[PDB]
Amino acid sequence: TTFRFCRDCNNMLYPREDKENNRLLFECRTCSYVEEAGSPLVYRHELITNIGETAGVVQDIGSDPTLPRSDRECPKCHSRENVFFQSQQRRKDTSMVLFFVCLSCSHIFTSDQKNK
């Protein structure tokens, strides 16, 4: 949703309907810090979410020994060594597709040919 915060007291703003121009105005509840909104979206709720299947990837992901190694193709540097792990989300109806992280360039790629 990309919440915006006030620049005076650091409080996240709320949308307010005005009949002067009929535009989305995000204002601060504390000091009336009124600003324009760069997107008409104010509320979003997903039932099935693909965000978090690649979570936890840092610059030192390949240094951890218990993550298994493969010999797949990394399409950024053509490397023969990479680590792989499934989706870290624990949903009961999630897929079993893997995610592969290269060590040379830290590029992530999935093994979903239905998606590809």
Next chain:
Amino acid sequence: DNDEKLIIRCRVVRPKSLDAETEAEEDHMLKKIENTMLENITLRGVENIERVVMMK
């Protein structure tokens, strides 16, 4: 049904009378309305039924 984007849209109708405080708190009641379509609307079937499978 043949569209690549599966979008259904809804709006609520404003009354002819003036609303001095309803429009300010409209977002919360629209959230409540989304919540009451989330679980309280039955497209088809009867209550107290979870999942049906077929066997031969």
Next chain:
Amino acid sequence: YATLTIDEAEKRMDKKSGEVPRWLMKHLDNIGTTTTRYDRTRRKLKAVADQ
């Protein structure tokens, strides 16, 4: 930003009342109740200075 007291807060956040309005203290500031210390001193300063 003209913070309020607690005696109204406990009554508002009990289930006695309905939905909390989004701009309640903006309406209170338009009325002029429980404002900042700066405005509270400025009102007395402009009352004394006009005499």
Next chain:
Amino acid sequence: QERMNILQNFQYNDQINTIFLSKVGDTSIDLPEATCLIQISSHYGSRRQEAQRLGRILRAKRRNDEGFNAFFYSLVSKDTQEMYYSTKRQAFLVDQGYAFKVITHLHGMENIPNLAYASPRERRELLQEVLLKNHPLIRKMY
């Protein structure tokens, strides 16, 4: 409740001795005893209404008093249809025997304390006043 309050204020309280009534008092309803009636207007030439109003004061308390005479005045507008309507209305009462004595002069108009519409402009203002006379969740959103 307002009607009953006015009725007991008429019956018991002494600073209210005059009560103005519409056609409701013409019918058979309970009214306090009175000795004086003033009939300003009426529903055209109805002979029934005259005796209906006159029977209200026929049950006066002072009937045992010697020399007591109940008062029944019929205010009419001269040279207009009040004369015709009242002459038609008094036919049953004069057939019963009552005599309607005419009064064209009242001693006290010259030295009345309160003069109503004495000024010509107030009379004109009254004249143009008469002329100008003739889903358990969506329920909170509305």
